[PDB]
mmCIF file with all atom_site columns, C-alpha atoms in Angstrom:
data_model
loop_
_atom_site.group_PDB
_atom_site.id
_atom_site.type_symbol
_atom_site.label_atom_id
_atom_site.label_alt_id
_atom_site.label_comp_id
_atom_site.label_asym_id
_atom_site.label_entity_id
_atom_site.label_seq_id
_atom_site.pdbx_PDB_ins_code
_atom_site.Cartn_x
_atom_site.Cartn_y
_atom_site.Cartn_z
_atom_site.occupancy
_atom_site.B_iso_or_equiv
_atom_site.pdbx_formal_charge
_atom_site.auth_seq_id
_atom_site.auth_comp_id
_atom_site.auth_asym_id
_atom_site.auth_atom_id
_atom_site.pdbx_PDB_model_num
ATOM 1   C CA . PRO Q 1 1   ? 18.561  -2.580  -15.154 1.00 24.89 ? 28  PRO Q CA 1
ATOM 2   C CA . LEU Q 1 2   ? 15.706  -3.008  -12.641 1.00 24.97 ? 29  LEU Q CA 1
ATOM 3   C CA . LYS Q 1 3   ? 13.955  0.259   -11.667 1.00 25.79 ? 30  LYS Q CA 1
ATOM 4   C CA . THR Q 1 4   ? 14.292  2.172   -8.378  1.00 26.00 ? 31  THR Q CA 1
ATOM 5   C CA . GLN Q 1 5   ? 11.418  4.090   -6.823  1.00 26.58 ? 32  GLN Q CA 1
ATOM 6   C CA . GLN Q 1 6   ? 10.181  5.290   -3.436  1.00 25.78 ? 33  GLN Q CA 1
ATOM 7   C CA . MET Q 1 7   ? 6.877   5.063   -1.466  1.00 26.32 ? 34  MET Q CA 1
ATOM 8   C CA . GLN Q 1 8   ? 5.053   6.861   1.352   1.00 26.77 ? 35  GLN Q CA 1
ATOM 9   C CA . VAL Q 1 9   ? 5.038   4.785   4.642   1.00 26.58 ? 36  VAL Q CA 1
ATOM 10  C CA . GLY Q 1 10  ? 2.315   4.470   7.345   1.00 26.30 ? 37  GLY Q CA 1
ATOM 11  C CA . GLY Q 1 11  ? 4.721   3.659   10.244  1.00 30.19 ? 38  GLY Q CA 1
ATOM 12  C CA . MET Q 1 12  ? 7.828   1.370   10.388  1.00 29.07 ? 39  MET Q CA 1
ATOM 13  C CA . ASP Q 1 13  ? 9.242   1.205   13.988  1.00 28.27 ? 40  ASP Q CA 1
ATOM 14  C CA . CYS Q 1 14  ? 12.703  2.515   12.923  1.00 27.74 ? 41  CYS Q CA 1
ATOM 15  C CA . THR Q 1 15  ? 15.764  0.325   13.854  1.00 26.61 ? 42  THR Q CA 1
ATOM 16  C CA . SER Q 1 16  ? 13.390  -2.614  14.522  1.00 28.02 ? 43  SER Q CA 1
ATOM 17  C CA . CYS Q 1 17  ? 11.295  -2.457  11.286  1.00 25.01 ? 44  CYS Q CA 1
ATOM 18  C CA . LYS Q 1 18  ? 13.033  -0.631  8.466   1.00 23.26 ? 45  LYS Q CA 1
ATOM 19  C CA . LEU Q 1 19  ? 14.921  -3.963  8.511   1.00 20.88 ? 46  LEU Q CA 1
ATOM 20  C CA . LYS Q 1 20  ? 11.680  -6.061  8.706   1.00 24.96 ? 47  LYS Q CA 1
ATOM 21  C CA . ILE Q 1 21  ? 10.693  -4.391  5.400   1.00 22.22 ? 48  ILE Q CA 1
ATOM 22  C CA . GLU Q 1 22  ? 14.095  -4.523  3.596   1.00 21.33 ? 49  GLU Q CA 1
ATOM 23  C CA . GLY Q 1 23  ? 15.386  -7.963  4.781   1.00 22.43 ? 50  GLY Q CA 1
ATOM 24  C CA . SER Q 1 24  ? 11.927  -9.404  4.249   1.00 21.72 ? 51  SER Q CA 1
ATOM 25  C CA . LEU Q 1 25  ? 11.537  -8.103  0.604   1.00 22.25 ? 52  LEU Q CA 1
ATOM 26  C CA . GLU Q 1 26  ? 14.925  -9.917  0.148   1.00 19.54 ? 53  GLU Q CA 1
ATOM 27  C CA . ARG Q 1 27  ? 12.817  -13.108 0.695   1.00 20.17 ? 54  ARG Q CA 1
ATOM 28  C CA . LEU Q 1 28  ? 10.152  -11.883 -1.798  1.00 18.20 ? 55  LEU Q CA 1
ATOM 29  C CA . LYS Q 1 29  ? 9.783   -11.775 -5.547  1.00 18.34 ? 56  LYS Q CA 1
ATOM 30  C CA . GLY Q 1 30  ? 10.826  -9.591  -8.610  1.00 18.06 ? 57  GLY Q CA 1
ATOM 31  C CA . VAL Q 1 31  ? 12.628  -7.135  -6.306  1.00 16.72 ? 58  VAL Q CA 1
ATOM 32  C CA . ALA Q 1 32  ? 16.447  -7.272  -5.861  1.00 16.68 ? 59  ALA Q CA 1
ATOM 33  C CA . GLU Q 1 33  ? 17.266  -4.326  -3.482  1.00 12.92 ? 60  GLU Q CA 1
ATOM 34  C CA . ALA Q 1 34  ? 15.500  -1.762  -1.199  1.00 16.13 ? 61  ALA Q CA 1
ATOM 35  C CA . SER Q 1 35  ? 16.498  0.978   1.372   1.00 14.60 ? 62  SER Q CA 1
ATOM 36  C CA . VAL Q 1 36  ? 14.604  3.170   3.955   1.00 14.46 ? 63  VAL Q CA 1
ATOM 37  C CA . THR Q 1 37  ? 14.357  7.013   4.204   1.00 11.40 ? 64  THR Q CA 1
ATOM 38  C CA . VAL Q 1 38  ? 13.705  7.427   7.972   1.00 12.76 ? 65  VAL Q CA 1
ATOM 39  C CA . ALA Q 1 39  ? 12.549  10.647  9.798   1.00 13.23 ? 66  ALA Q CA 1
ATOM 40  C CA . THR Q 1 40  ? 10.136  11.329  6.824   1.00 14.07 ? 67  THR Q CA 1
ATOM 41  C CA . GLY Q 1 41  ? 8.212   8.000   6.487   1.00 12.72 ? 68  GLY Q CA 1
ATOM 42  C CA . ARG Q 1 42  ? 9.657   6.989   3.075   1.00 13.01 ? 69  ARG Q CA 1
ATOM 43  C CA . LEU Q 1 43  ? 11.046  3.733   1.618   1.00 14.83 ? 70  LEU Q CA 1
ATOM 44  C CA . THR Q 1 44  ? 13.056  2.994   -1.569  1.00 16.50 ? 71  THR Q CA 1
ATOM 45  C CA . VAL Q 1 45  ? 12.577  -0.286  -3.418  1.00 14.09 ? 72  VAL Q CA 1
ATOM 46  C CA . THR Q 1 46  ? 14.573  -1.504  -6.459  1.00 15.12 ? 73  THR Q CA 1
ATOM 47  C CA . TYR Q 1 47  ? 12.620  -4.025  -8.543  1.00 14.25 ? 74  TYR Q CA 1
ATOM 48  C CA . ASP Q 1 48  ? 11.946  -5.766  -11.851 1.00 14.20 ? 75  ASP Q CA 1
ATOM 49  C CA . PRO Q 1 49  ? 8.219   -5.527  -12.880 1.00 11.24 ? 76  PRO Q CA 1
ATOM 50  C CA . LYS Q 1 50  ? 8.399   -8.623  -15.231 1.00 12.82 ? 77  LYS Q CA 1
ATOM 51  C CA . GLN Q 1 51  ? 6.728   -10.816 -12.541 1.00 11.38 ? 78  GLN Q CA 1
ATOM 52  C CA . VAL Q 1 52  ? 5.709   -8.946  -9.296  1.00 12.80 ? 79  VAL Q CA 1
ATOM 53  C CA . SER Q 1 53  ? 6.555   -5.464  -8.005  1.00 13.31 ? 80  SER Q CA 1
ATOM 54  C CA . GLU Q 1 54  ? 3.912   -3.532  -6.001  1.00 14.24 ? 81  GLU Q CA 1
ATOM 55  C CA . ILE Q 1 55  ? 2.502   -6.738  -4.440  1.00 14.03 ? 82  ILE Q CA 1
ATOM 56  C CA . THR Q 1 56  ? 6.046   -7.594  -3.100  1.00 14.43 ? 83  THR Q CA 1
ATOM 57  C CA . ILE Q 1 57  ? 5.885   -4.467  -0.887  1.00 12.86 ? 84  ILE Q CA 1
ATOM 58  C CA . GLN Q 1 58  ? 2.149   -4.939  -0.127  1.00 12.31 ? 85  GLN Q CA 1
ATOM 59  C CA . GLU Q 1 59  ? 2.771   -8.552  1.063   1.00 14.84 ? 86  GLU Q CA 1
ATOM 60  C CA . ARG Q 1 60  ? 5.240   -7.309  3.659   1.00 15.20 ? 87  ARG Q CA 1
ATOM 61  C CA . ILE Q 1 61  ? 3.605   -3.985  4.682   1.00 14.85 ? 88  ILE Q CA 1
ATOM 62  C CA . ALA Q 1 62  ? -0.005  -5.351  4.934   1.00 13.19 ? 89  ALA Q CA 1
ATOM 63  C CA . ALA Q 1 63  ? 1.311   -8.460  6.806   1.00 10.88 ? 90  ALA Q CA 1
ATOM 64  C CA . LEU Q 1 64  ? 2.527   -5.995  9.528   1.00 8.37  ? 91  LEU Q CA 1
ATOM 65  C CA . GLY Q 1 65  ? -0.665  -3.804  9.836   1.00 10.02 ? 92  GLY Q CA 1
ATOM 66  C CA . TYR Q 1 66  ? 1.060   -0.717  8.272   1.00 9.65  ? 93  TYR Q CA 1
ATOM 67  C CA . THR Q 1 67  ? 0.301   1.402   5.104   1.00 12.20 ? 94  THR Q CA 1
ATOM 68  C CA . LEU Q 1 68  ? 2.206   2.079   1.831   1.00 11.79 ? 95  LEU Q CA 1
ATOM 69  C CA . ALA Q 1 69  ? 1.708   4.299   -1.284  1.00 16.37 ? 96  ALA Q CA 1
ATOM 70  C CA . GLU Q 1 70  ? 3.859   4.257   -4.504  1.00 13.02 ? 97  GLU Q CA 1
ATOM 71  C CA . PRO Q 1 71  ? 3.323   7.425   -6.709  1.00 12.01 ? 98  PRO Q CA 1
ATOM 72  C CA . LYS Q 1 72  ? 3.456   5.367   -9.947  1.00 9.96  ? 99  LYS Q CA 1
ATOM 73  C CA . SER Q 1 73  ? 2.201   8.179   -12.361 1.00 13.65 ? 100 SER Q CA 1
ATOM 74  C CA . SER Q 1 74  ? 2.296   5.615   -15.222 1.00 12.66 ? 101 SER Q CA 1
ATOM 75  C CA . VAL Q 1 75  ? 0.339   7.490   -17.997 1.00 12.77 ? 102 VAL Q CA 1
ATOM 76  C CA . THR Q 1 76  ? 1.009   6.632   -21.708 1.00 12.47 ? 103 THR Q CA 1
ATOM 77  C CA . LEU Q 1 77  ? -1.053  7.431   -24.857 1.00 16.45 ? 104 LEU Q CA 1
ATOM 78  C CA . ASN Q 1 78  ? 0.291   8.647   -28.299 1.00 12.91 ? 105 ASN Q CA 1
ATOM 79  C CA . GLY Q 1 79  ? -3.261  7.771   -29.689 1.00 13.13 ? 106 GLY Q CA 1
ATOM 80  C CA . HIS Q 1 80  ? -3.203  10.476  -32.444 1.00 13.05 ? 107 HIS Q CA 1
ATOM 81  C CA . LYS Q 1 81  ? -5.748  10.603  -35.377 1.00 15.57 ? 108 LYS Q CA 1
ATOM 82  C CA . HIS Q 1 82  ? -4.477  13.083  -38.111 1.00 15.17 ? 109 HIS Q CA 1
ATOM 83  C CA . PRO Q 1 83  ? -6.666  15.461  -40.296 1.00 12.61 ? 110 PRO Q CA 1
ATOM 84  C CA . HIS Q 1 84  ? -8.503  14.079  -43.389 1.00 13.83 ? 111 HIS Q CA 1
ATOM 85  C CA . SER Q 1 85  ? -11.783 14.286  -45.552 1.00 14.23 ? 112 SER Q CA 1
ATOM 86  C CA . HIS Q 1 86  ? -13.028 14.456  -49.251 1.00 12.08 ? 113 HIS Q CA 1
ATOM 87  C CA . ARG Q 1 87  ? -16.077 15.464  -51.462 1.00 10.65 ? 114 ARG Q CA 1
ATOM 88  C CA . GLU Q 1 88  ? -17.316 16.065  -55.130 1.00 11.20 ? 115 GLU Q CA 1
ATOM 89  C CA . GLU Q 1 89  ? -20.584 17.819  -56.054 1.00 11.81 ? 116 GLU Q CA 1
ATOM 90  C CA . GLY Q 1 90  ? -20.204 19.290  -59.661 1.00 12.64 ? 117 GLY Q CA 1
ATOM 91  C CA . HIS Q 1 91  ? -23.865 19.031  -60.786 1.00 10.25 ? 118 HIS Q CA 1
ATOM 92  C CA . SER Q 1 92  ? -24.985 20.891  -64.003 1.00 8.12  ? 119 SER Q CA 1
ATOM 93  C CA . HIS Q 1 93  ? -27.355 20.736  -67.118 1.00 11.58 ? 120 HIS Q CA 1
ATOM 94  C CA . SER Q 1 94  ? -29.269 23.098  -69.543 1.00 9.16  ? 121 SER Q CA 1
ATOM 95  C CA . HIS Q 1 95  ? -32.660 23.360  -71.407 1.00 10.64 ? 122 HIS Q CA 1
ATOM 96  C CA . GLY Q 1 96  ? -34.579 25.506  -73.999 1.00 8.49  ? 123 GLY Q CA 1
ATOM 97  C CA . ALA Q 1 97  ? -37.371 25.272  -76.646 1.00 7.17  ? 124 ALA Q CA 1
ATOM 98  C CA . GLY Q 1 98  ? -39.818 27.352  -78.791 1.00 5.81  ? 125 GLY Q CA 1
ATOM 99  C CA . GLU Q 1 99  ? -41.632 26.821  -82.136 1.00 7.49  ? 126 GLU Q CA 1
ATOM 100 C CA . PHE Q 1 100 ? -43.961 29.826  -82.785 1.00 5.65  ? 127 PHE Q CA 1
ATOM 101 C CA . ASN Q 1 101 ? -45.599 28.797  -86.112 1.00 7.47  ? 128 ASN Q CA 1
ATOM 102 C CA . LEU Q 1 102 ? -48.725 30.526  -87.548 1.00 6.33  ? 129 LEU Q CA 1
ATOM 103 C CA . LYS Q 1 103 ? -50.425 30.586  -91.016 1.00 4.91  ? 130 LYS Q CA 1
ATOM 104 C CA . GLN Q 1 104 ? -53.994 31.082  -92.421 1.00 3.82  ? 131 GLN Q CA 1
ATOM 105 C CA . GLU Q 1 105 ? -53.666 32.905  -95.834 1.00 3.98  ? 132 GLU Q CA 1
ATOM 106 C CA . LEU Q 1 106 ? -57.444 33.427  -96.728 1.00 6.45  ? 133 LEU Q CA 1
#
């Protein structure tokens, strides 16, 4: 029901620190679960974004002097326009004249 997602990690001293992330996020906010991916510098977190999410991990990781990066990719758009237009231009008219009279007689 809450989302699960994984970050890049700038250190975490293994046995002594994977825990100081996980069981310190347990004291934080909006999150409910987390779990490390050791030997490759990665961490899972499982959170609800309806209050606080990224900051929860940033609180803990910055308050140890280490780095984090979540690959959030969160693009959305659907901002379509559709084709359209109009006109009208049917101009016209006509004209003509001539009255060639002549007389004199004598």
